[PDB]
Structures are given as C-alpha cells and as structure tokens.
Amino acid sequence: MAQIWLWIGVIGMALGSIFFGIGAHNAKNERWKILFTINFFICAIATGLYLSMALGQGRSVIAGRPTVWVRYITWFLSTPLLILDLTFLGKTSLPITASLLGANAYMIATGFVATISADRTIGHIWYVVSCFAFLATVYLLVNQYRKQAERNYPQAKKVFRKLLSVHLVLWTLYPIVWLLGNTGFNAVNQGTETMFYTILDITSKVGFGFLSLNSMHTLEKNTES
Amino acid sequence: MAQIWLWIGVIGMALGSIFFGIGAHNAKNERWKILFTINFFICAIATGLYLSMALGQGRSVIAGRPTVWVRYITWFLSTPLLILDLTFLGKTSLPITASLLGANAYMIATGFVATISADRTIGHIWYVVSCFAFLATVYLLVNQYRKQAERNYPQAKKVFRKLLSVHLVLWTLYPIVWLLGNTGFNAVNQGTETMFYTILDITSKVGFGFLSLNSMHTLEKNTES
Amino acid sequence: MAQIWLWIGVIGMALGSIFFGIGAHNAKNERWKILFTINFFICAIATGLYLSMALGQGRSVIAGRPTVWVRYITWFLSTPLLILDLTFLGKTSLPITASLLGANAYMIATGFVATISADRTIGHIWYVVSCFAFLATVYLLVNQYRKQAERNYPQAKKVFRKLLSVHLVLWTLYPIVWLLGNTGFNAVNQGTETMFYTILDITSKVGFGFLSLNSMHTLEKNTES
Ligand SMILES: CCCCCCCC/C=C/CCCCCCCC(=O)O
Ligand SMILES: CCCCCCCC/C=C/CCCCCCCC(=O)O
Ligand SMILES: CCCCCCCC/C=C/CCCCCCCC(=O)O
Ligand SMILES: [Cl-]
Ligand SMILES: [Cl-]
Ligand SMILES: [Cl-]
C-alpha cells in the first residue's frame, strides 16, 4: 500500500511540474512567469522527495520505529515556496513575508526534531512547539497578511478568503496525520499514513498551485485598466 | 551546573523573544517592524537551541569528548541576523553586507568543523581558519561598515562606535571560551563552559537586541525633520 | 597522487581568493566590487573544500567504496555563485535567475544523492536526474539567459558566447569524470579522478573568475558614454 502511494506521489508531482513548467515557458508577463516558476519548483522538489521515498530512501529505523526523515528536508524547501505563492499574490510587506517564512521554517525544523527524537516525550514537546509555530503563521495569515492583501485588492477579498481557507484547512491536517501515525498514537498503519501524507502533499502542492494560478487570473481581471 | 544554565538560557531567550515580539507587533513604522522582527527571530532561534540542549539533545561523545554540535547549527542562523542588525542600522551597501554575512558564515562553519573533528590537531587548524574569518569581519566592520555608517549618519558616529565596540568585545570572547573548553586546553569544566556560552549568548542576543533598539531610537531622533 | 592534487587545489584556490580579494578591496565602483566579491567567495569556499579534503576529511567508505561527500556540500554553495557571475553580467531577469539557481541546486543535490547512495542502481538513477537538471540549465542558458544578455548588450554578443561556451564545456566534463570514477565505471583510479576534479575546479573557479572580470571590462568599455 505504502509503495503504490509513493509512486502515485511521484506521478502526481511530476505531472504538476510538467504543467507548471509549460505555463512558465509560455508566460505572457513577468508576474505570471514568477508565479508559474514558484509552483514549478514546489512540485519539482516534491517529485524528488517522492522518488527518493519510492526508491526506499530517506527512512531510518529509530529505536525500532520506522521514520521517514527525508520529507522534512524537502518540506523545508517546498513549504517556503508555498508561502511565497501567498505573499506574491498578496503583495505582502517585507517584515510580514519574512515573519511568515521564519515561522514556517521554525515549524518544519521543529517538526523534524519532533519526528527524529528517539525519546518520544521530547519529540512530543517539539510537536507542541511546532504547532505553536504553525499557530503563529495562522495569526499572521488571517491578520496582517489578509489585511494587506485586502488593502492591495479591495475588490478581491473573496480571492484571499479562498486562498487562506484552503491553505489553513489543508495545512492543519498535517499535524493531525502526524498524531495518528507512528510519531504519535500509531492509530493508523504506515500504509495509511503514507497515503494520507501523499494525498495531502499532492493537494497542497498541485492543487494549491492551480488555485494560485486561478487566483492570479481573478486578481488581474479585477485590476484591468 | 550545566543543566541549570541551559534552562537559564531557555528562559532568557524566551523572554527576549516575547519582548521583541511585542515590540514587532506594536511597531509604528516598517523600519521599526523590521528591526524588532530581526531580533525576535534571533532570540526565537536561540530559545530553540537552548531547549534542545536543556533536553539533552544536540550533543555527541566524539572519541570520548562530549561535544555540543547543535549550537553551530543555530548560530549559523542567528549570527547572520545579528550581522543584519548592524547592516540594517548602518544602511550598509550590498557588497559589504554580503561580505560580512559570507565571512560570518565562514567563521561559524569552520568553527563547527574545528569542534567536531576527532583529530584535534585538524580541529585546531580549523580554529585558526575560523579566527581569520572573524578577523575578516573585524576589518570590514571597523573600516567599510563604519565609514559607510558615519557617512549615512554624520551626527551619530558615537552610536556606531558603541554598537561596534559591544559587538567586537563580546564576539571575541567566544573563541576564548572555545580555547578554555574541552575543544582546546580544557582549562574549565563543562558546567563552567556551559555557563560562559550561556551568558555570552544571552548578552549577544537579548543584550545586543536591546542596544540595537536604543541605537535605532537615537538614529531616528538625530534624523528627525 | 591524490594527496598532492588536493594540496594543489588548496594552493590554487587560495591564490584565486587572494587576487579576487585584492581586486574587491581596490574596486572602483559597486558593480566591480560585487563581481570581485562573488569570485572571492567562490574561491574562498573551494579553498575550504580543498583544505578539508587534503586533511583527510569529507570522505566515507560506503559499502566498501571510498566516497568524497564534502565536495557536494561546498559545490552547493560555490556553484550558485558561479551562476550569479553569469546572471550579474547578463543582467538576467528574476524568474530566469531563480530558475538557473533552482535547477543548479537540483543538479548538485541529486548529484550528492547519486554519489552517496549505497545502491548504485539507485545512485545511477539520480545521476540521470542530475543530468536532466543540468540540461535544464543548458536550455535556460542558451535561450532565455543568452537572449536577455544580447538584448542588454547588443554590441557584446561575443562576450556572452565566450562565457557560455566556457561554462557549458567545462561543466559538462564533471558528469563525465563522475562516470569514469568509482561512482560509475571506475575506469580511472582515485588519484586520477582527484586530479581531474581538481583541475576542473581550479579552471571553473579561478579560470572562470578571471574570464568574468575580463568580460566585465569588455562590457563596460562597450557601454562607455
Ligand atoms: C529556506 C527558506 C528559509 C526561510 C527563513 C526565513 C527567516 C526569516 C527571518 C526574519 C528576520 C529578517 C527580517 C527582515 C530582514 C531584512 C533585512 C534588511 O532589510 O536589511
Ligand atoms: C544563512 C545565511 C548565509 C549567508 C551567506 C552569505 C554569502 C555571501 C556571498 C557573497 C557573494 C555575493 C555578493 C553579492 C551578490 C549579488 C548578486 C547580484 O547582484 O545579482
Ligand atoms: C544556496 C543557493 C540555493 C538556491 C535555490 C534557488 C531556488 C529557486 C526557486 C525558485 C522559485 C522562486 C522564483 C522567484 C520568487 C520571487 C518571490 C517574490 O517575488 O516575492
Ligand atoms: Cl517536498
Ligand atoms: Cl542560536
Ligand atoms: Cl567548492
């Protein structure tokens, strides 16, 4: 079960990469080129992640617990680009963009530590720390980020509501899966955990990528001369 | 002794993070927001460092020598932000800012190698290399950095004299502690070495953070219309 | 044989660093200062690489195969700066510069995995992936990069032809050496592989560095008022 889902991730991320790459190649306009390029690299990174996992790499048995450490290495690179999708579209200021990237980096880094710690009590402490770094991004997203985006696009508040809703709902599912997996309560087996992360990753990357493009289209139409 | 000092670091860095975070939240002005945000992340990173150390993590016994490797990983992230405190306040040019960040990164990276090398002769070679990278930053700080800062703030030369004096004196103490610790002559025990690095870290982060804010206030008053 | 070539690399990169550092120190002009500084750090990084290798570091025996992993860590830092040499001189747009840096990072990262994988079939898969990331940069260099550079310097097309020819020919030799070495067919011994990478590195760093400076001189003369 796990193995097929890892190849599904390879396929889905590769297809995402191909179609964003084609979009980048054909873009009319530097802003469109940038947005397609961000999403290309989000999916190209994840394609590499899923190939490594599908090939059996990136995994260690830590004190008897099979542990996939590689996803944190690539998530550390792909999730800031997803943040940049948001801050590019929202024309977010530098300190708020930096704060989002920094809090996100903190979330991924402490999630890594929460995962690889042999002492699972210590790991769960880092899980809480990582959750608070995520909550920091939630606060920044629904306050400063949203208010700046609505100031920049007064007629497109719904666009950013949808972007934020999709980001926030999907990203909250990751710490839930983590608690269900063998990092937490071990309520689902590895094949199911792998399926869950794969579906989340494809949706949060390919899916959010296409939503970001559709959002860009709506923003540009709203701000046509 | 070591254990209590690691928790003291957790507490001190957490408090620094809280008060710079409050400052960032209430900032009047993008430049103030940026400066508070830099210092928030300096202290938030170090809070994570000290929690990991306090929990017993980040340490390996290398050929019989207890070695804390984690501080180099986080120092690699927090010290460039301290450099950015300086270059933000000094409005330093891009090549000099890049040179400072690059020489600092070189210092931390070779300090890491100096620390983790099992062959302590090789480690001491890297110690000398790291000292020369530090001396490179000294040269850049007291020459190009200072001259640009004084050109940008002709009436605030004392502000940058104090910033530089505090930076240079405090940062020079780190390679001294390193020579006293079990990385060098082992003239102080681990508890004393831990106390020394903890006090240095709190002063160089929380202390320098507050000095950077006070410096900003003086600069803005000097340049009020 | 290997040992002498590693010290030759130390010497050659140190000399490159010294002369670009002198150039940076004496630069007339921010653009010249930037260009000298990029090349200084390219060579300073590689000086550290070669010192570590010369001292016996950065190497592991993986399943009986001596493997130098450290060169990928420093190449990950020095090769983007070589890309920046090109994009600085060509005044390349942000999405194309980002795409070049991203594809290059992908090349080095998957080259690392191709190298350290114990399963050499898996390693060779990553070799192909890395080759395609290189081919991506080739496409970007000879198309978007070149066309932008020629638009920015209509009278200096030959300058960028020479820069690109030297970059492309030299960088293609690296995956050839990799196939000849014990990562691939093991057609040359370690001393010869080490010599090959050392000569390539000195040429691609010190040599390309001096070519970039000469190119800058030609560009500025072509665009003198
Ligand atoms: C791989 C991506 C990692 C992202 C890490 C982000 C870290 C964010 C840290 C924030 C502090 C910096 C705030 C803005 C600094 C601006 C500097 C300046 O204007 O000179
Ligand atoms: C985690 C922080 C690490 C910081 C590393 C800093 C490396 C500095 C390297 C200097 C070379 C670059 C000099 C300026 C390049 C400008 C590029 C451009 O203008 O296109
Ligand atoms: C050590 C060097 C590593 C270099 C990695 C480069 C990664 C490139 C990724 C490309 C995606 C970003 C494209 C441009 C983003 C611009 C963001 C913005 O304008 O707000
Ligand atoms: Cl990923
Ligand atoms: Cl730190
Ligand atoms: Cl290098």
Author numbering:
A (entry chain A), B (entry chain A), C (entry chain A): 1 to 225
Paper text:
The only characterized MR proposed to pump sulfate in addition to halides belongs to the cyanobacterium Synechocystis sp. PCC 7509 and is named Synechocystis halorhodopsin (SyHR). Here we present the crystal structure of SyHR in the ground state, the structure of its sulfate-bound form as well as two photoreaction intermediates, the K and O states.
Using red crystals of SyHR we solved the Cl−-bound structure of the protein at 1.57 Å resolution. The high-resolution structure reveals 126 protein-associated water molecules, including 27 inside SyHR, and 20 lipid fragments surrounding each protomer. A retinal chromophore is covalently bound to K205 and is in the all-trans configuration in the ground state of SyHR. As in archaeal HRs, a Cl− ion is found in the RSB region of SyHR in its ground state. The ion is coordinated by the T74 and S78 side chains of the characteristic TSD motif and also a water molecule (w401). The distance between the RSB nitrogen and the Cl− ion is 3.8 Å. Notably, the coordination of the chloride ion and water molecule w401 in SyHR is tighter compared to NpHR. The structure of SyHR in the ground state reveals two internal cavities at the cytoplasmic half of the protein, which we denoted as intracellular cavity 1 (IC1) and intracellular cavity 2 (IC2).
